[PDB]
Symmetry: D2
Subunit: 491 residues, 4 copies
């Protein structure tokens, strides 16, 4: 068959593994959304169009670099490239915009560190943007610079040498960095965020629930809608994951920083744990950093990078991301393309049998009519190999709860809320459709055309063929919060 | 707790995932054996000693390069470094030596980097006269029939698939092409022709000479390149000759056809190497993982070693720290079920050979503790067919007994490793300490996850019963000495009712 | 908690067993329907009213005894008792009426001098079974006449013949030119015209006599709801019954009774064609060794369950009560295990037709069934059904399963379905929701037949259809709730799943909604 | 295949149920041991021989009746019948002897010059419950004398008294000064000296009268092997029994009978202290509502299974056979479900002590148990036990589980264990191998007590020890095999798991070996 159906029907995971078939072509829209970081290499309107076709879902603005004006152009160009296919509402692909916070980053200033040499922190001199650095490093203490390559030992002795450039990483383990999760800058940044209507915030170095309360606050009332994604970048964040989660809209497994703050051998446990948990919680999780680095420079990924992406997806990740691969490398589109291609395969390899079982089995009872509908809708879909679940949603919550259970059928989410449509990419397998029509006199009719719109757009992009069954999820009255109906229709 | 015990006790895989704890230190010998490739960077006796300390179990000799003499030194140095710790039998680590076959390779026609422009014109000559005359527009190539198999609109890849050539004028003197993916070309690099039915045989006159060399110098294992079908290994066994029935044959799966005929290849090989390198060119990059996952699954089910290889840690050929992906690569290989993981450029030529070995060690230990044994043992028991081989019966009893008392180890007496191999099939968490008189057996056993071989030197006792006991005692002692076993641990001990192989049938529970 | 909820939440069956709590009161309409057999003891209209209150869902007419007239009173009385509560539509309980076919009886003769006389067959004495037409009547201490000619042809030298409800037994020691020269194995008192069973040996006699045919016609005439068809041995045997049933009776459900080795052996093919199965332990417990029935019973139920077709457990579930006011320790467990096995219906024969404790017996089955119903490890059971029922593209099935899943998620008190033939109700019950299936229908007959499905509670809707189809649907749902409140299936604050369709007429169920009371 | 092997290999319980095959003959010694109660009908040496052949493993002496002398003959005859086959050590079957305590019972009194005579407590009539010593012998239709002085002090107005298997029932409505004036609720034939129970009212009677104590001592003198201890309500109740038992009886196994609500409620604590459990359905089925026993039965068995301790299912499993040669459909399923529930032993009371079919009864349990034994879904059951039994560091337990795993892998015919107290055998059986546990011991007593464990088949070894310990072990193993061939547990070509220890004397089992026959 296709979509690894023989593997999907195995009675055990081992069996399932044993039936994975390289000639079994994927046959299903990829559901893992791709976040690409905007930079010199991917800023041009025209470059942006190409990245949208290759499958970019979310543009990441990295406030670790660039100016306010510099990023507004970034935002402006994304919006232009995106509005260039508004030609055709059935085909039009929304693209989220995510501000990625600078936070307690410690960086160098504007030569080779000789292992053994005496090297000061205020070839041998390193200026740091953290003045309190000399309040938090005791004697016999370690300081890591530029992606953990350069090691220093506090006056400091170099323990690991390395080539150093301008303005690069600083990480201080062991010591608890009183440096605040939110500088005066971050605050200004987040305000910029609200002004330009970013959709998502990726919040650097979150160490505790307060850290997000901070962000929400700074975000202001003009930004209740914005989703907040807490980036876990160090030992403490990991340790207090639960609490962070409870309060964040979802998580970013920030492997970069993390891979320095804690020993490299351990990330995978962190990554696997965190995704597991977000999955259980029903909240977006992003896997990030270095998934495809070699491509910053080469047109083909290395054998490890490939398996990285697949394992991220198999792990359970809602989104996968690219940094240098898209912001600066010589192969931005090719990189997007590859994640697309890999994600589809891994998506078809997911052992839904075990996965759906386990989620049902661990999600607690519930009395929210929306949740009740979702799970029934998901069960119904599996029973008839439905091609899609089509939901009418006003904030995405309804789409989000369906995706929680990981249907194999696509969630086609129909909404009037441009913003909701953009944010919904954070949820695996949700395909948003932006509805433009003015409401019908009769509420019932207005529902129908929305469902119809959903099918139609559905046919058009190849999610649905004549003869397929589709599950349709609606509510008993207008306005959000009342999803409570599930119907089975044939195309 | 430690060794991710809270995760180990979960009722589900999801739950298990959720309980994975970064502060839970591993606390167990690493089981996944490491194969390190020998090159300029790792040939010095003293380098070799260091690599043994950091955890090298198996040395790969790559017959794609170097001369017979060149490899005999390789072998001679390994053996030396290894015999340097025979000072103390309790501590001594054997090391396998693996000959890796050249096979139907195709290579380009020295510190010289011709750049093959994007959207230019390339000629592939196979003409003696141009056996080196390979500039901006010319590449020679040691496979004549390249001109014969590659049709117009066919693909020709060069050097790890990074360079791309589409044929578009098949004419009198050779292959006129166009450069799709351009790039920097080097002296003598791999060539791949997907879609083409490269008529070259799995076993050249060279491979045959190579394998004979293998037998003469007593290599322990053959990694057999480009195996496409059962016959291909029959070839190898043949060439290997009678002086080499003992040698383990590991088929490398390097292309679409091998994958397609995996079952038949497996049934005949002693194990499998998932050759991601070539495989990552022959089939689309997006797909390897399915292959890798499938083949490991299958070898697991079958009970036969499987190797994950190539590009697990490349960035380290050049940098002292792995990239985020390479790390998870290694973990997932082990989590996938791999018996061995390997290193190529990372050890043969890179600037960080030992650091590389160290890392794999460090990662493998964590992933080893992350293995959901509850689901895994259940599924193996449940798919392995009944059996009437007393050795298999004992093994599974022994593996069950071990889980029941969190035994620190199973100690087996073995003459060919078969008994150890059957214990590891089931993936005990306890270590398999394998005591043998067969130097070779002790080497080959590294191909089995979680088997720790001990080479017994003493002359046999007058009383066979006594001779067994000392062997067991020898097992314990060495065991205490390397920190596999502490006083108060329980240990499962597996022996047989009479001397000579094939009669393992007894399992005993002892306290240290 | 109640309804053995702690046991319901266990992670394994063993665990589950361990958390069974005797102080955890059931709290849920019993789902296992009860079939009570009508005889002298339970024929009076007033007796029938009492049995309806105690929980009778199905009345069995046994055509092995009584005349056409005799059964028409039977039917007339039932209907009368039942129509006596039509006073209140919210409360009204329909009752099925099931004809139980006679089929290939094999009978001894009239007894020397009497239809009322008895003879005693002493253990170890010399005994003659003849097929000699003359002694059809002259039977005694050493002789029994049988109305199956071929007997002196089908029983080997050393075979066994079971007489009178399996209580007398004979071993053929010599084959005779006039009758099988046997030895008495099990002694006993022998009556006029009693039953024979012949295990091992094949019996060719037809599954449908001239009588059965007349009976089934009588069936159609009086509008029975269900036929329990005795000795079904093969698919043809039901085709026979359908046929005989005639066109005036396509509606009738046909329940094949498996009463011997061969039926068991051909169970699959019988099932494929029957509307469900009756595990006939009586005959069965004689045609095949007594040790074995359980495997049969357990097999058949498993299989029906898998198949989504009603299965009845029957015979001797409570016999001591034909005579005593309390069941023995075994009978009790029998009932529970039947329910636990997966049974859709459980039945009573002597216990209701003739015994001194008809109502008490019905009461007991009620009481036990409720307890077992709560002990069902739904967690494993729903998992296993989902996992083995094949994909499906019937919108009704799809809706059913989603409806069932939705219910578990909010401990819904009920699923309320609108159904025209019961199909939609039947599919929900297939999956064994713990919530009740309140089925609303205009088809008096459908409401009766639906009791064959575990946990389906039928409501007969009487109102003339509304001008607006949508409105008519709503009142039906409302009617479902209201009746639901009224009998204690639903309280204010409960959640309820409602299952309807997108247009009138059967076959189009395809909508599931979540409502709060 | 046989032994329901296709069912055994199913992937789910549903599936397993579906594949149960009535033509799949069992092929395996039956494992569930049978306890038969000794009475008039089963006391004769010769009768006892027959009962041994039919499969009796444990003789129950019921100290609720008979005298010390009367029971010593009981014992003396059992031992005789049993020693009659010592002719051949390979085939010799040991037989446990179990003393069943009287405890806090409460009987009505003897009847008006009537021994085997009866009287009817008419429904609705006027009945007086006395304690007047003078009325002890004057039982009648209007008067019932009870041996419980304090009855008058505990049964308040509108309190309930029930007599003889709970069939007779009395409503106290009047407190007089010489007795309790009761209304009869459930009328009926009353006999002499029949049981009384008092639900709702706590009974200040002690678990151990001066009699019980004398009884227990008698027990130790005559070397009974097991004590079934009536009405155990709490841990203390067993401490009592142990105590009374004295030091001359540390070896005796104590089986606590759970006979009422409180025992149930405090099961855990009773278990922790008893050697095993008897689910006393009789009393229990009166103390608590009949609908609930099954939960209790199922709970207790589950829990003893989890604990590793014998559990007995008892009372009324086969009553109809006290009087008839064939069991009713429920009794049969009762036995099978008891076995499928997880019971280690099943028992017969009236069926063997007094009825007209003692041996036939034993035979039937045998026959049923074999079938149910092969129906056990080992796949789920062994998984669940591994998964719930806690880690352990006892080398004996470790070896047992390995041995049990090994056996499953090769469909071993048997695990053969050398055991001194049976503890090694008991641990193997805990995991419920499908292979038989052939237990070889020199301890006649151990060999007798081991029947309390499912699927343990004890062999008594008679030879004087060999000079060389190693050789002595081997002959014991050899003895095991040989005896095993001889009774059909093992055939040439089978695999057998053999479990031994590293040194003599109990407590050191720690070795497992795989041998081919
Ligand atoms: K940042
Ligand atoms: K090679
Ligand atoms: K009949
Ligand atoms: K007693
Ligand atoms: Mn960061
Ligand atoms: Mn290769
Ligand atoms: Mn019948
Ligand atoms: Mn009692």
């Amino acid at each position: 068959q296709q979509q690894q159906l023989p593997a999907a029907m195995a009675d055990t995971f081992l069996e399932h593994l044993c039936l994975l078939d390289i000639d079994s072509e994927p046959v299903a829209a990829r559901s893992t959304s791709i976040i690409a970081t905007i930079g010199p290499a991917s800023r041009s309107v025209e470059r942006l169009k190409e990245m949208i076709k290759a499958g970019m879902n979310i543009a990441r603005l990295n406030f670790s670099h660039g100016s306010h004006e510099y990023h507004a152009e970034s935002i402006a160009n994304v919006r232009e490239a995106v509005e260039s296919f508004a030609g055709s509402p059935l085909s039009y692909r929304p693209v989220a915009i995510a501000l990625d916070t600078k936070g307690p980053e410690i960086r160098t200033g504007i030569v080779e560190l000789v292992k053994g040499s005496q090297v000061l922190v205020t070839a041998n001199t390193v200026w740091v943007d953290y003045p309190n650095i000399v309040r938090v490093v005791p004697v016999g203490g370690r300081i890591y610079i530029d992606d953990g390559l350069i090691s220093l030992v506090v006056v400091t002795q170099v323990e690991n040498g390395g080539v150093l450039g301008s303005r690069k990483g600083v990480n201080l383990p062991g010591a608890q960095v009183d440096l605040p999760g939110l500088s005066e800058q971050d605050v200004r940044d987040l305000r910029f965020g609200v002004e330009h209507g970013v959709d998502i915030v990726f919040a650097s170095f979150v160490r505790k629930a307060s850290d997000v309360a901070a962000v929400r606050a700074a975000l202001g009332p003009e930004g209740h809608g914005i989703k907040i994604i807490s980036k876990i970048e160090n030992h403490e964040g990991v340790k207090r994951f639960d609490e962070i989660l409870e309060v964040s809209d979802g998580i970013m497994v920030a492997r970069g920083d993390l891979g320095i703050e804690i020993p490299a051998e351990k990330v995978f446990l962190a990554q696997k744990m965190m995704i597991g948990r977000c999955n259980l919680a029903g909240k977006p999780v992003v896997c990030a950093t270095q998934m495809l680095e070699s491509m910053i420079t080469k047109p083909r990924p290395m054998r490890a990078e490939t398996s990285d992406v697949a394992n991220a997806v198999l792990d359970g990740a809602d989104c996968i991301m690219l940094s240098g691969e898209t912001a600066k490398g010589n192969f931005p589109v090719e990189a997007v393309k590859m994640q697309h291609a890999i994600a589809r395969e891994a998506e078809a390899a997911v052992y839904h049998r075990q996965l759906f079982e386990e989620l049902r089995r661990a999600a607690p009872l519930s009395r929210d009519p929306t949740e009740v509908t979702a799970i029934g809708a998901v069960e119904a879909a599996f029973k008839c190999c439905a091609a899609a679940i089509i939901v009418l949603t006003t904030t995405g919550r309804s789409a989000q709860l369906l995706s929680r259970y990981r249907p194999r059928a696509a969630v086609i989410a129909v909404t009037r809320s441009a913003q909701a449509a953009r944010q919904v990419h954070l949820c695996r397998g949700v395909f948003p459709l932006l509805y433009r029509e003015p409401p019908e006199a009769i509420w019932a009719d207005d529902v129908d055309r929305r469902v119809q719109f959903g099918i139609e757009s559905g046919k058009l992009r190849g999610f649905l063929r004549v003869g397929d069954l589709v599950i349709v999820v609606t509510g008993w009255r207008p306005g959000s919060g009342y999803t409570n109906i599930m119907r089975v229709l044939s195309i």
